[PDB]
Each structure stands twice: as C-alpha cells, then as structure tokens.
C-alpha cells in the first residue's frame, strides 16, 4: 500500500528507466518498512499492481 506519488515513479522507472532502479528501491524500501514482508509473501500482488495503470 503505497502513495500515488511513489507508485508513479516506481512504474515510470521500472518500465522506461530500470537503469535507475538501485537508488529508488533503496530509498522506497527505507520509507516503506512493510514492503519487505509484502514482497516476500505476495509478489504476484506487487507485480499486478505494477502492471495496473500501466
């Protein structure tokens, strides 16, 4: 469950700028402690969410 602001970047970076993943993931994962556990058990969720509004 992310802000609309970050999810914009995540989608933009993932689809057209994956060369810039490293710091954005570093940043976002530091600001979203929960994400850690989310990815671990619900990857398909995070996936479909990234493909949503794509």
């Amino acid at each position: 469950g992310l802000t609309v602001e970050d999810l914009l970047s995540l989608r933009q970076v993932v689809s057209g700028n994956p060369e810039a993943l490293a710091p954005l993931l570093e940043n976002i994962s530091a600001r979203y402690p929960q994400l850690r556990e989310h990815i671990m058990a619900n990857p398909e969720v995070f996936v479909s969410m990234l493909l949503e509004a794509v």
Binding site: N17, E19, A20, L21, S29, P43, V54
Partner: protein, 502 residues
C-alpha cells in the same frame, strides 16, 4: 575491527537484507522485461519496421514445408534470420555506449553508495522508445528489442530474451571491490537481451543475437551467449534467463543457456531453497498471460533432456547441495541407502591421483526418524517394525530410527457424548498435526480460547502444539489453544468474541 575485515564476511542482518533486496530487484527487472515486451508488440511501430524487410527475405522467414528433408527448411529459416541480422545493422545507424553498467549486475557497495548521490534522470517514455527504434538511435539493448519488434512485424514467433542481473545475494563479502582494468570491454562481451525464434520444422527455439555477438545458433549443450571467465561474470552472472513472446507469455528459459544449471547455477538463484522455489514460481505466473501451447511441450521436452544430460558434476563443491545427487560422504547420519542400491556414479577428485568418491542419486536415499520424531508428525510405529539404524545421542543413548513404511498414521480416539477428550498425563492433548485432532472435534487456537472454554464450563482439552526452549534451561510446552467437540465450536467462538465480558 581488522579481523572482521580479514575474513571478508558480513552480518546475518546483511545476509537477509541482501536476500530480500535481490528478490525485490529481480521482480522489478522481470516486470521491466514484461512491459518492454509489450512495447515491442506496438502496432504503430510494427507497420513501420515491416518495410525494412524485402519480399525475398520475408519469404525466407516463412519457407515452404519440405517433406523429404525438413532440414532444408530450417536452412532457409536461418538464412532469412541472417539477412535480417544484416539489414538491422544497416538500419541501426547509431549505437551508444551504456551510461553506467546498463542492466549488468551491480555490486552491493555500488548500490549502497548509489542512493547517496543524485544523477540525471533522462526519462524514457513509451513513445520515445518507438521513435528511437524507428530512427535507429540507441544503446545495444534498445537495438535487439527493436530487432525483435521487426521480426514480430514479419509475423515471426520472436521472443525477447532477458538475462536479469540483480545483485548476488550469495555474495556475502563486506568488501565487494572490482578490477577496474578492461572493466567495460569485459562487461559488454556478452549481451543481457537477445532473441529466440521458433523453428517449426526442427521444433526447437533458435537463438539469435543480432547486435552484440552477431550470431545465430541452435543451442544443444553449449551457448555462445553464456558468459565465460571470472572477469566477465563479475557483471554477468547468468541465472535468470527469461523469455517473453508475442502472446504475452513468460518462460524461464535459463536451462538452455546454463551448461551447469543444477550444480553451478541453482546455488546462485533465489530458488536454491523451497520457499524461494515457490516465490519465483509466483512471479512467473504473474507474468504469464497466455494458455499453454504444443510449443511449451516441445521446449519442456528439450529442458527435460537437458537435465538428463548434465549428469554428475566434475567437482566436490558442485556436489554440495545438489538436487539429484549426494556424495557417499555427505549422507547424513539419519539416512540410509534404500535396500539394494549402489552409487550411480563416481567423482574424480581434482588434486589427488586416482582419488575417487562414490556418488548416490538422492532418490535412492531414505530419511529415518526416531519413535518420538515420527510422533511429532502424528505417526506411530507399526506392530512388526524393526528399525533400520541406531545412533548414540546425549541428553549417551541408543536411539532407534525407523523408515516411513515402518510407521503408521496415528488416529486418536473420538471424544465422548459430552465431548470429553482423552488427554495425557499433564491434562492436555498433544496436537502436532491435523491428523492428531480427534475426528469429531476441532482445534481452536486463540490466546483466550482456554479462558472462554472454562467460563462456559463445557468439556474441553488444552492443545500442546509445540514446545518453547529456553530460560536458564529446560523446556516448556506452548499451549496455543483448545480442542473441543465440533458442535461447541460456535459457542466457543462466541465466548472468545466477547471475552471482555467474561
């Protein structure tokens, strides 16, 4: 400390964060491939690139079926592919250098420091990508992607192939420095993206790298695209080769490219353990937007044979955590070789003349548990069961070990009419398996489930589901809840719901 750095290992906290980050990063990469694959299918782009391919060449891409020798058709296919490789070199009028390691594997140190500093976010949108491909302006990645887009616009079954390079979570080094010498030239020696094309006549995928190595090949055991040499693999650790198709498929096509999938590469995937196995399978499933074809069957047949032909590895460390094989010497004390079974191979030990080790297939190894151990899976020993092995163990004690077929499923007695459970000497029911729950009762796990039952004065039994180990010493049982007759469940669930009133 200096000793902390001598042995160049990191903390367990780091191990887990690297492991997670690896996964996170991997997902993003794979999703990137999936989205890029979409862009390739772009109809506006398609009709443009289609024009780059002469009628002659188009005809070679769909050769007429040859009865007497299907090979002659494969030949014609390969020819069209080659000519396509050529006019693409011609079309792509500018190649750029990668800006900073492209999508090649970054080191942990590089990632830690990356956050720290700003960079110029040269934004790429979907349109930009199309315009780039049609003008022939871009780095080697965009190039092959455009090439794929061209082949698809000639109605050939062309895959985008992406070798995902997340950081190595198997890398436990605190210092992750790299050799600066010839660093670029060695990184670009092998591509990250390439192409696979389906040969219907021979029923195999053809491997096509039109941009980097500029070759077309029919991988059998070796691939020219699997990076080789310590130097190169510093930025190109091959472990997730993913294939995306026209119809929005997504297949883990690594097996093709990894000479040593099972020994060498397994060790390097998030897939080494069983949790990661399922985890990855989920990511694939989430990217696979088509139903299975006969082609999927053909490729699986190929992969199946590739596993068969890899065979016993050449080196001891490679037979460490192997999915199919174990060294005689690595058979755990709690294991025996299934009756009438030998080794299935041998291993020439590198370093000592004529030194050889017996190798067993994991499937010929049987796991034994003790009387107690089995009971922790709701299992008791059969009437006429003799044990298979004996071990000395301290609390020195000869503990006997039994095979699965010596064991019987433990069925506990039914609860009485009043719902009276028959319990142990401590006044509880041991419940370590769904099997251990009486067949007319239910397990209700709740911190207050015990309190609730007592309040309703109804007949129950506390559930010992596991044991907690600790304190100065000794063990204490974890009572996680209640076993009660099924017909009292909703009564209990109600009480539980209103505990604050009890």
């Amino acid at each position: 400390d200096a000793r902390r750095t001598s042995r160049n290992v990191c903390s367990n906290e780091e191990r887990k964060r690297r492991k997670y980050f690896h996964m996170l990063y991997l997902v993003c990469l794979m999703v990137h491939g999936f989205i890029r694959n979409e862009w390739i299918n772009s109809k506006r782009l398609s009709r443009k690139l289609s024009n780059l391919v002469p009628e002659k060449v188009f005809e070679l891409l769909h050769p007429q079926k040859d009865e007497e020798l299907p090979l002659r058709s494969t030949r014609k296919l390969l020819d069209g592919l080659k000519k396509c490789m050529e006019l693409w070199q011609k079309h792509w009028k500018i190649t750029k250098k990668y800006d900073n390691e492209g999508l090649y594997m970054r080191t942990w140190k590089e990632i830690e420091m990356s956050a720290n500093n700003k960079r110029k976010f040269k934004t790429l949108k979907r349109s930009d990508f199309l315009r780039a491909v049609s003008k022939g302006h871009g780095d080697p990645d965009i190039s092959v992607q455009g090439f794929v887009a061209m082949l698809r616009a000639c109605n050939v079954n062309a895959r985008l192939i992406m070798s995902c390079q997340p950081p190595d979570f198997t890398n436990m080094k605190i210092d992750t420095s790299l050799n600066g010498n010839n660093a670029y030239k060695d990184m670009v020696k092998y591509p990250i993206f390439w192409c696979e094309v389906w040969d219907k006549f021979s029923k195999k995928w053809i491997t096509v790298d039109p941009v980097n190595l500029k070759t077309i090949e029919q991988v059998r055991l070796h691939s020219k695209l699997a990076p080789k040499g310590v130097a190169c693999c510093e930025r190109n650790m091959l472990r997730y080769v993913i294939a995306y198709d026209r119809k929005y498929g997504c297949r883990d096509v690594t097996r093709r490219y990894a000479q040593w999938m099972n020994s060498k590469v397994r060790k390097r995937r998030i897939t080494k353990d069983d949790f990661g196995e399922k985890w990855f399978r989920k990511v694939i499933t989430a990217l696979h937007h088509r139903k299975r074809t006969k082609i999927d069957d053909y490729e699986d047949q190929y992969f199946f044979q590739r596993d068969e032909s890899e065979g016993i590895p050449d080196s001891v460390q490679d037979l460490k955590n192997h999915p199919y094989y174990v060294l005689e010497q690595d058979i755990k004390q709690t294991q025996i070789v299934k009756p009438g079974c030998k080794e299935c191979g041998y291993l020439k030990v590198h370093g000592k003349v004529g030194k050889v080790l017996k190798v067993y297939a994991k499937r010929d190894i049987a796991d034994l548990k003790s009387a107690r151990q089995w009971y922790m899976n709701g299992r008791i020993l059969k009437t006429g069961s003799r044990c298979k092995k004996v071990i000395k163990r301290t609390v020195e004690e000869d503990e006997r070990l039994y095979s699965f077929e010596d064991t019987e499923l433990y069925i506990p007695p039914l609860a009485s009419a009043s719902g009276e459970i028959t319990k142990n000497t401590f006044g509880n029911i041991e419940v370590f398996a769904p099997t251990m729950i009486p067949g007319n009762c239910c397990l209700v796990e709740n911190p207050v489930a015990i309190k609730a039952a007592r309040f309703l004065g109804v007949e129950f039994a506390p559930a010992v589901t596991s044991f907690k180990f600790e304190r100065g010493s000794t063990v204490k049982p974890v009572l996680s809840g209640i076993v009660v007759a099924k017909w009292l469940r909703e009564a209990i669930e109600t009480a539980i719901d209103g505990i604050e009133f009890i």
